[model samples]
Target chain A: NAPCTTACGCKSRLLKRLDLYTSKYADGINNERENSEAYSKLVTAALAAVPTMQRKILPLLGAAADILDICRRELATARPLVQAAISKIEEAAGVYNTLHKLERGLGEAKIEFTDLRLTKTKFRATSLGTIHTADCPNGEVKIGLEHEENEPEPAKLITHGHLDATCASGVGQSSSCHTTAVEANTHLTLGLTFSGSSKDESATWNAATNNKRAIHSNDADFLGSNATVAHEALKAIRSAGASTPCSSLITDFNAVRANPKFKLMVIKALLNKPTAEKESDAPADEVNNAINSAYGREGSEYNTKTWKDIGSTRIPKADPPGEKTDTIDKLSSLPQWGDAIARLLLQEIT
Target chain B: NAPCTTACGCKSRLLKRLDLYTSKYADGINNERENSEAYSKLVTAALAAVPTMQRKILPLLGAAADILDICRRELATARPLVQAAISKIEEAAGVYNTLHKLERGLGEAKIEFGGTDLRLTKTKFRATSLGTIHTADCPNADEVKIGLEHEENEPEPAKLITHGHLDATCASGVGQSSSCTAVEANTHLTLGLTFSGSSKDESATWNAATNNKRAIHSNDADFLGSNATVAHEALKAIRSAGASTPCSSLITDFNAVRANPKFKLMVIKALLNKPTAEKESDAPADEVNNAINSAYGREGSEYNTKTWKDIGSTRIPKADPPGEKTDTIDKLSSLPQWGDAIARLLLQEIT
Candidate 1:
């Protein structure tokens, strides 16, 4: 044990013996070499397989990524268009408001009056009065009138009419019920009758007919039917009111005014209608000539894609060709459309 | 205040006045109806427009949604496949580790040795012993030596080689080679046995070269070239025990194969050509037949499609024929594939 240091030949001799054993097992060592070589090949082959596998799979991953990209791009592109459509819808809603208000304005107009009097007495043929419209802060149009007392009575009476005005201008004053004298009258009463009672005397008359009477009273020698159609139209409009849907008060005024029948009624109420009689065609002819002079026979040329001429029996078609035409038409025919139109009309005009 | 209010007749007179007003303007009521109808139409039109607008835009949105859906579906489907690929890769790595261990085993095997002797001598192989692999904790079929004394010389020796074993039967029992052997003979020693001392001294006859000499002495083998191709293949495998692309060693060990030749050389040694013998190829022939009989020509018929059968003189063809035959042949002829094959042969058989 004491001499077992590295300087001794112990280690050297041991190395020699090891060399002897190593020399004998040559084939055993070769066999091991073969084993090692086989393992390396297997490993290399295994490693190479991965990227090869990835090459096959990456394209699918890339495809998935591309599809997502396309979806993102499309969404980005369409977002603004959807927003623009919404904006257009908002703008259209606003337009509907204005139209609705006008409709209501027309619907609420009070153009006819009965039970006319002055100073507790039936008005004379020479009765004087003023007619005008008042606007309420709450957006309603009111019609009112004032009558001047004659020399004996000297008491003035002011009465506001029951029907509200859709739209009206300055006060109209009439000095007498005469056809020639009141040919240009926008408002007047004619064919008046007095009550037989001494305590209270009142007059009653057809507003439109009275207007005609006033025009004719002045021109007995000039017997013309200038006021007849206008007055009759005015009366007709009043009857039409019950059947008309008036959801919106103000815009409906304009809507009503836009109707041909309403226009005819307006002409009859405020101007004159043509007469069939050849002799009396002068006034009607004059009215037509004046209109034709200003805007031609068919009136002013204007355009709106929205306003379609859905005939009396047919439904309005949708724009952009093949679309929900039936649904739109059904909505148009429903009372709901009138209701919404009138509400907007009332809000805007009144 | 109550008396004054009652006597005033304000409500009665107001009602009367209202009645009068009501009678005065009948036309106003009529006009309102027309207005209301117009309003209804406007709203209905407005509401209808919304759906119309939607009809135009929905198709585009739907298309976009469809693309998203496709992407989602593909990703979901691919997620599992990718995971499976990864799992397969992991398993492949395990297989590579075993192969790599085998590769190292054959690469470092020392089939030749010098300084052999027969008389009683103390071996440096017995003076000291060191037994530890410098690699990671992972185990490999490494080759080691242990030596023993027949009955007297109190010397012990052990040696560890760089090579590993695929499998082994004993721990070896000579003083230099540490393991026991089943000292039995079957059939014939068509193999040789040799020794340095007197043949009468059984103990001396059992010396280093004697152990090998005994294997060949009894049988002067009539070797044939029946398995020359397979033996050549086995030799080729041994030469392949060098560096190869060993990618993610812990994961896709297979991924390592993509390494450039320089990298392969760094991990594995370069190929050394075995000496060709113009003499009777008895040893090589016998070795070849023995291998073929045991494992069959190319191990199993199922082999890598990538490895080709191009001899040195002929152009290497692609394992899977059709495109790039020349290129694949060129690659196979290079040192790498041959080395790969040699290492592969060693692993399947030697251990």
Candidate 2:
């Protein structure tokens, strides 16, 4: 009888495991269905536009330009219509243009940065030459520590920084990075950068303060990551009753920065830069390189003894690095209202 | 004493003409003052901006890009500071960079349009090799009335048989300008556009445009001279009005661009003209007659009594109906297409 009871206990435990997995799979199917539906609506429409723009529309513009050119050549003084038509066609196809020019301009302007870690001073890297335009008295650069799995231990001397004035955009020379000025905590330091003609222009303009350098260093209980919390406001009320978890709760921002596939959701807005006429899109060559960096040659081979040999002009593998991204929302959206509500209870800051 | 009335009448008539001439001079002086003031405020400000943009600022941006490049290379992976700095710099200098790209594209994509004046089958030209994007009908646009003079393949006597108001686009901000001036009489004007920022090329382009404009002003011999002169200022105001900014805000989609009141007044004056023949013997042996010689017929043809009829009675489309959304919808819809083009390339590459 004792052994039979033990057997029954083991059977119930196994059944519980079975139920957990069944429910898990049920949710998985639901998520997959949602993803596919979104993909169909958004991605499918996108796919359809491509063939038309590239094959159908773009050609028509090119033809229009040429056809007008005939009028341009034939007429002693070009008519207003033909000239206007030519300009419009070129303007319409501006995206396809502007690459070699970017590269060409990239080569023309000279830059020499002096840093200890750099192998050579003449590093032909990309540039941001807009501090001049923003006209901010000084350039402000910012940096933050990130948690990298590969680089486990924190740096012996953590990096920190600040800006003198609130400038719209800044460049290397324009900005100065701080080492210890900023307080240490996990936060989203989304410093601004320039962009050309592309669709990254959809970010909310009002909220996008270029100089917002700080965030809440505490846990993101309101960010929906906590399960024990009943409702954010309810939990927040309970927390107010308590004291220990007050400001000590710190979120691991590195984990947030680690998965960038989600960063696709954060769009950046730009109206008219380099003036509205021209755009600064990333070049195709660099595009390929960055893609290559993220995913090594799909389906390729590797050899043994992978160290650069003195005379091995022949073989081996090679590699890369990337720009840091520590953008994270650190504050809770809930406003602090109680103190004012109890006018008798506390300070009335609001 | 008997001739006193006759003498008095002649004297009064002379005085009337004299007063008219004096008032004309007075008006000219007043107009000159206004032109000078405008030139000082607007043109002077623009010129001042030019020097500051070119000399004081652009250098810092170039230095920033370099310093940033070092930071990018210094670390195994670029730090947030270095990367963002790089992007912002490029973006700021985007004007100059894009400027170069523009010339390159235009320079390279030089299309030579050649074909019989009207051969639906043979009407094609280069466009990134997207030539298949065509069909058989000539789109609804025209060129007109001509007797055959060119042997063959000489683009049919250059006249667009298109329907349009006989005048020029009234320099309205709403639509493009054309060989149209508010349908030769009545018109609706509009405003606003994106002006250049602190750009080296932007300045270059603008300055070049003005040069072209000056040439046109002088060559056409419109009453305006193209610069500081009072006459030039009048046309300058016209050009300024035509490039006419939004008197208020530059939001293009709103019903803000309606029939300009000034255009209405302009037409009230224009609705008054009659063409009557003035008998002049064939080609008065004068410079003026020679000017119109090529304007009419064969290059060397003698100028005859040019009794030509102007294209009569031009009409315009109705004013935009009341209430918005739809206008913006069309524009907003186009805006999305820009995004999709941007996304499609990246998306296709991803797949």
Top-lDDT structure, candidate number: 1
RMSD of 1: 61.8
TM-score per prediction, in order, is 0.14, 0.12
Q: Please compute DockQ, using alpha carbons, for every candidate against the native two-chain complex.
A: 0.00, 0.01
Provide the overall lDDT of each model, using Cα atoms, as 2-decimal numbers.
Answer: 0.22, 0.20
lDDT, candidate 2, A221-340, per-residue tens: 110111111112222322333211111100111221222211121111111111111112334354334323322232011011110110121111111121111101111000111101
Off by over 4 Å in 2: A1-83, A91-96, A99-193, A196-350, B1-97, B100-351
lDDT tens per residue, model 2, B1-351: 111112123222222322332333334333323322221121111112223221211111112222222222322121222222222222222222222221111110011112212110111112111101111222243221111121112121111111101010112112323321211111121100111111222223322232111101000101101111221132223233332111212111112111222112111211111001111221233532233233323322311222011000111111121311112111322212222222322232333
**Best model number under DockQ:** 2
**TM-score leader:** 1
